[PDB]
Design a protein around this ligand. Structure first.
Ligand SMILES: [Mg+2]
Ligand SMILES: [Mg+2]
Ligand SMILES: [Mg+2]
Ligand SMILES: [Mg+2]
Ligand SMILES: [Mg+2]
Ligand SMILES: [Mg+2]
Ligand SMILES: [Mg+2]
Ligand SMILES: [Mg+2]
Ligand SMILES: [Mg+2]
Ligand SMILES: [Mg+2]
Ligand SMILES: [Mg+2]
Ligand SMILES: [Mg+2]
Ligand SMILES: [Mg+2]
Ligand SMILES: [Mg+2]
Ligand SMILES: [Mg+2]
Ligand SMILES: [Mg+2]
Ligand SMILES: [Mg+2]
Ligand SMILES: [Mg+2]
Ligand SMILES: [Mg+2]
Ligand SMILES: [Mg+2]
Ligand SMILES: [Mg+2]
Ligand SMILES: [Mg+2]
Ligand SMILES: [Mg+2]
Ligand SMILES: [Mg+2]
Ligand SMILES: [Mg+2]
Ligand SMILES: [Mg+2]
Ligand SMILES: [Mg+2]
Ligand SMILES: [Mg+2]
Ligand SMILES: [Mg+2]
Ligand SMILES: [Mg+2]
Ligand SMILES: [Mg+2]
Ligand SMILES: [Mg+2]
Ligand SMILES: [Mg+2]
Ligand SMILES: [Mg+2]
Ligand SMILES: [Mg+2]
Ligand SMILES: [Zn+2]
Lengths: 108, 16, 45, 240
RNA sequence: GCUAAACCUAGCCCCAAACCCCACCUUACUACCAGACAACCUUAGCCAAACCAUUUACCCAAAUAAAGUAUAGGCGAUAGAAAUUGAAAUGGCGCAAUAGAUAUAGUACCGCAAGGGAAAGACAAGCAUAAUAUAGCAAGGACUAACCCCUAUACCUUCUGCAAUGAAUUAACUAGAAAUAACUUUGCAAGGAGAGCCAAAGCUAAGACCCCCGAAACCAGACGAGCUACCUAAGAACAGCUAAAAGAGCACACCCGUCUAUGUAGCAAAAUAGUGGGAAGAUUUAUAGGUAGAGGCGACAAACCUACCGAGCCUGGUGAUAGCUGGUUGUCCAAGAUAGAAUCUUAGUUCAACUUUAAAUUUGCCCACAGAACCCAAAUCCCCUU
RNA sequence: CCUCCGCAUAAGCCUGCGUCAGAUACUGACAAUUAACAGCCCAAUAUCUACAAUCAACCAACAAGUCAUUAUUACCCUCACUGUCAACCCAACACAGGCAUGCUCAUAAGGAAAGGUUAAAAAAAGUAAAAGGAACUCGGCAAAUCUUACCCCGCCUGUUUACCAAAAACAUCACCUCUAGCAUCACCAGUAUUAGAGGCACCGCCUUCCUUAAAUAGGGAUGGCUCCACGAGGGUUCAGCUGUCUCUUACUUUUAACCAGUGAAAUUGACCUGCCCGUGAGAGGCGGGCAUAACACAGCAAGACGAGAGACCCUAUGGAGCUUUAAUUUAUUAAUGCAAACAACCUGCAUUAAAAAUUUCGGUUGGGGCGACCUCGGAGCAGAACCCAACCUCCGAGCAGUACAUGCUAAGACUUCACCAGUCAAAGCGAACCUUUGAUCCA
């Protein structure tokens, strides 16, 4: 059914400026005490997560180079080692992924 | 039946 | 169902609306003359 | 329209000629005869309807051997390839014409009546009165034009002076100079009447198509009506 | 404060004067073989006649005048001479980007085609700043005070009058063109006027007054059969099973379109899904050609002929015509009302009546008596007074 | 996880996801498709060519099926030119449509139904369903299943309203009727067993009961007939089957709602847009009452004479079409006739036809049929100047009789509400000594 009359800007303002339509202020935004970045309470810090994702991507590139081909998932555990690190007694019998950078502070 | 009337294309092909 | 009445073919196009067919009759010569008078870039098809 | 008749061949030949269908259309491209169109592709066999056509540098009555009797797509009658001397030609075959038969073509009007054997051509003056004939000319040397369809047979009704009265298959009398040639017997394929088309498809094969709007005059077909005179206008449509 | 708003010349209009390498008709823009086809032929109709049927002005070869005269003419709408007479010779009280050319261009774009044909370059509306408070044509009277109080049935047009019509809003554009007389003001005056014409105060001059958009149509000349209808030439396709040389059966491809549902500015200006009919034939189909509008084509459904065919499309006649519909733009004042006749006339018109303006003159309206028929009511008419 | 998809040719298109650089498959620049495939041919003149195809051998035919070469005369050079890309064309679109052919028959090729979430209603599609099994409904439509029997119509296969009708309509074999005795552009390179047109319908022959429980349904007691077969035709029925229904439910997908991106259309006088009763012929806005803080969101469809289209009736001295014993013609053809030219052919003038062409559609009475009426006069019908009750009722006149001054002129008047027209009339002159219509033009 077609509108019977043009809706006035007064009516339209009353409609589209209702609090139901206004953007609500978020009160779960704080500062990541680790790095001082803004994060939501329940969500991971975006900057820290980007760090972790980039490091994981590098490790996975090294894993792909080591595996060399599809369907080559090892049947043994994996350990990531950075420059100046040596496999431990526990790290024996586990495939070693060597990273050219130094051990990140947030990695342990 | 009345056939549809097409407006000229230039009205809608204008660019900055 | 309708709308695709144009089924292109260059043979038919030239044989139906071309320069030679236009000149083949006095009426078509006057067609070309009218297009020339109007200044059409394309006199025939 | 760019219509040129297919009947352009100038020299007689035995080879079937590729004939173009018309569809009932004039050279103008407009329908002139309705109900024509399509059908089986056909080839035309040039029929020599002048049976007394002595070969080049030759004259007098001549005989011919029936090489074969063939179905002709372009006729009701079946045709006969017949060879004489050093030439072959297509003629209209008579009812009992067979391959290997001999045919006589004469221009000799004998004082007595020539024994009329089926299939041979004599001037109408030489035939006995009451003989069945076909492929009748209208003028001497014109060429056969009458009594040509399958199973047809005119009758040599009378011969007086140099004029013969023929009964055409339509039972109409025709006067022809007795010097005009006709062939004895009835035309072949005598059972052409009894053929049953059976289905519309067979007519479509024969090239007949169902066609409407055959009149092109305003109001279409209109049977003739008697226009009453002024005194009779009072009784045209008397109510009950 | 955004969107915007504004601008002035790009040009155009009307006059005057002047007379203005190569390729390409084959499939145009294609270096290079047997021509011969080569053109000529009253316009019609719209329209006016209030229908229409005879009829109804239309580059003419010196303007004016003769003269709208002679003539012609369903003697009517209207048409309309000639004899004769003899005119001299670079500009704008034009537009300024919705104007002026369509034009930045016959381009883009649209169409198969003929054809159609643009736009534009230099704090309006709408919003935001700043949503909203009972109640109501949104205002007015007001009020200390926005609302609350009281009053108040939007505008235009068409109807007898309220219902109906139109309008989202802004900007720009968009609609009363003229004679016969009159009247007014000059000039001159028995004459006026710069030949012609008028004149028994006239003549000469000026001032004032006669809209816009819209059919279905008709005719002429083109353009259209790449859709579709039919045809021509030369092609192509048709599994498997059953049957056996079949307008055979079942059923793919393919063609169609029975029924249902979805979709209904959709994917689609006719589609989708399922179902269904035909599926070696009167089959389907590619290519090229042909038939053209009162014509074609049609297994007739008035079907189809480029999406809108009881008669295509385009251009022109054409600013067709419309007694019909709609519209018809500053301010203010004043006068201003229903009404008979005829009419192919009752949706109109002409005359009358009314109405308006100007002018001349003298009675006008009301009415007391008196007066107005025999056949056998209320009132009306008429007019001294007033 | 999906696809009658894909790859090529044709046709069409014309650089339209190649690279780089700037932007947000766009812009600019650079590059590219290489001939063997395909196209672009033939030196002519003559003369030649009956013998299908279908594995072409048997068998099987009718609808009878291009295959064009050889002799002589000329001839000597040799590989040019053009197409070659793409995710493509026609549908206004990056459109679920249209689109020829060869191969692959599920792909060796080609693709992605889900932007994210939630799991409302309504909506679409699908799946399942107790008991029942058409009780639904116009109708078993749809769905699920699988059968039976019979009527009406049409013989059959076909065709048709592209885009609401596929049919009983059109066609059709068959039959009938009518017309035509014939050549060089259709018919027809035909010739009465032929051709054209019309009709008809293949063919063949003779001349109250039953059904249900309930049944406006169904079935049965030259024409008349005969339904073999066939049918998405139209009716009826047995049985079965089923969510059609009793009576609906559950789930999935789409849609949906929320988040993000992009972002229309019809519509709209302005609106600060309530309810009841009344008014008006129908009220949100008028009257009297009642109610009433303000705004989102999702639904609904009672109102907004909702929106957008359309139907019905009437009108116009508006169109157009059709048919005719409407009117006007016969220019044109076809026949004749008469002149003209010396039979043919042709010109002019007539007459008759065919084919057409142009044009019109008065008024009153709910409409239509059949009517009647349309002007004038007299009466009702208007009580008392005039005018009027139109429409309406009755009657009669398109005159008759008389006279043949029943002449000519002329003051003044009347008047059917205009005009046109129509009346009366003194005086005078002259003879004697009145009681019902029609203009102009044109003849
Ligand atoms: Mg096509
Ligand atoms: Mg007129
Ligand atoms: Mg302009
Ligand atoms: Mg503003
Ligand atoms: Mg409106
Ligand atoms: Mg075609
Ligand atoms: Mg098969
Ligand atoms: Mg079959
Ligand atoms: Mg057809
Ligand atoms: Mg019909
Ligand atoms: Mg059209
Ligand atoms: Mg007008
Ligand atoms: Mg006043
Ligand atoms: Mg009249
Ligand atoms: Mg009127
Ligand atoms: Mg489209
Ligand atoms: Mg997807
Ligand atoms: Mg989604
Ligand atoms: Mg169940
Ligand atoms: Mg029932
Ligand atoms: Mg049952
Ligand atoms: Mg029921
Ligand atoms: Mg069903
Ligand atoms: Mg049938
Ligand atoms: Mg059928
Ligand atoms: Mg249809
Ligand atoms: Mg249908
Ligand atoms: Mg029932
Ligand atoms: Mg959104
Ligand atoms: Mg009410
Ligand atoms: Mg209202
Ligand atoms: Mg709501
Ligand atoms: Mg409406
Ligand atoms: Mg009376
Ligand atoms: Mg009077
Ligand atoms: Zn952090």
């Amino acid at each position: 059914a077609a509108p019977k009359n043009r809706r006035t800007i007064e009516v339209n303002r009353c409609r589209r400026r209702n609090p139901q339509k206004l953007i609500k202020v978020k009160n779960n935004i704080d500062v990541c005490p680790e790095c001082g970045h803004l994060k939501q309470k329940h969500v991971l810090c975006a900057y820290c997560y980007e760090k972790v994702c980039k490091e994981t991507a590098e490790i996975r590139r090294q894993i792909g180079k080591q595996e060399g081909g599809p369907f080559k998932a090892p049947t043994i555990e994996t350990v990531v080692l950075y420059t100046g690190e040596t496999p431990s007694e526990q790290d024996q019998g586990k495939r070693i992924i060597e990273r050219d950078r130094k051990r990140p502070s947030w990695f342990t | 039946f009345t056939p549809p009337i097409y407006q000229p294309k230039f009205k809608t092909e204008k660019e900055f | 169902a309708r709308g695709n009445e144009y089924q292109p073919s260059n043979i038919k196009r030239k044989n139906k609306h071309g320069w030679v067919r236009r000149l083949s009759t006095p009426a078509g010569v006057q067609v070309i003359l009218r297009r020339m008078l109007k200044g059409r870039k394309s006199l025939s098809h | 329209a760019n219509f040129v008749s297919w009947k352009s061949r100038t020299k007689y030949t035995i080879t079937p000629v590729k004939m173009r269908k018309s569809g009932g259309r004039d050279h103008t491209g407009r329908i002139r005869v309705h109900g024509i169109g399509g059908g089986h592709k056909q080839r035309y066999r040039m029929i020599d309807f002048l049976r007394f056509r002595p070969e080049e540098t030759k004259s007098g009555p001549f005989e011919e051997k029936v090489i074969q009797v063939r179905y002709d797509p372009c006729r009701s009658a079946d045709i006969a390839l017949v060879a004489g001397g050093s030439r072959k030609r297509w003629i209209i075959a008579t009812e009992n014409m067979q391959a290997g038969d001999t045919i006589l073509n004469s221009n000799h009007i004998g004082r007595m009546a020539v024994a009329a054997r089926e299939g041979d051509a004599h001037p109408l003056g030489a035939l006995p009165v009451g003989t069945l004939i076909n492929n009748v000319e209208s003028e001497p040397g014109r060429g056969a034009q009458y009594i040509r369809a399958a199973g047809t047979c005119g009758v040599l009704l009378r011969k007086v002076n140099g004029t013969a009265i023929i009964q055409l298959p339509s039972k109409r009398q025709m006067q022809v100079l007795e010097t005009c040639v006709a062939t004895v017997g009835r035309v072949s394929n005598v059972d052409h009447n009894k053929r049953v088309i059976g289905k519309a498809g067979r007519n479509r094969w024969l090239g007949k198509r169902p066609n409407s709007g055959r009149w092109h005059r305003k109001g279409g077909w209109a049977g003739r009506k008697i226009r009453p005179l002024p005194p009779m206008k009072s009784y045209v449509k008397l109510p009950s």
